[PDB]
Amino acid sequence: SKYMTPMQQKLNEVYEAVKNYTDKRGRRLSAIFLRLPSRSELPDYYLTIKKPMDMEKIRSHMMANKYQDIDSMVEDFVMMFNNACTYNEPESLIYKDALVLHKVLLETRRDLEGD
Ligand SMILES: CN(C)Cc1ccn2c1[nH]c(=O)c1c(Cl)cccc12
Hints:
The chain has 115 residues and is mainly alpha-helical. It has one domain: Bromodomain-like (Histone Acetyltransferase, Chain A). It has helices at residues 6-20, 45-48, 55-63, 70-87, 93-111. Helix 4 (70-87) runs antiparallel to helix 5 (93-111). The two termini are 22 Å apart. The structure holds the ligand CN(C)Cc1ccn2c1[nH]c(=O)c1c(Cl)cccc12. Residues 2-112 form the Bromo domain. This is Protein polybromo-1.
């Protein structure tokens, strides 16, 4: 069916709020987070990040209908943001963008608390 259940609609709304967020200059902060590069590209990344995560992984899990609740999706986004803030320096743009998208995530979930 093309009709999503209420839980599926809520998962999709959360995912899309993070994906689609743009700053005041029109930059889509999710860009860098869509797909993690390889070991070759980020030498230290897979040696230092225990549980790699990107938005394509979350999206595919969502599309396979494998998230049972909203907390489960939020957990994977929070993992991704913690990973970004572990690998990257606090002065880096990626670290700053992770912090903004984390707020988008939490604000979106809270604004759907009644739904
Ligand atoms: C270019 N550079 C130093 C880092 C870089 C470039 C790509 N990505 C990162 N760092 C990340 O942690 C990261 C995460 Cl969570 C998810 C997806 C992509 C990421």
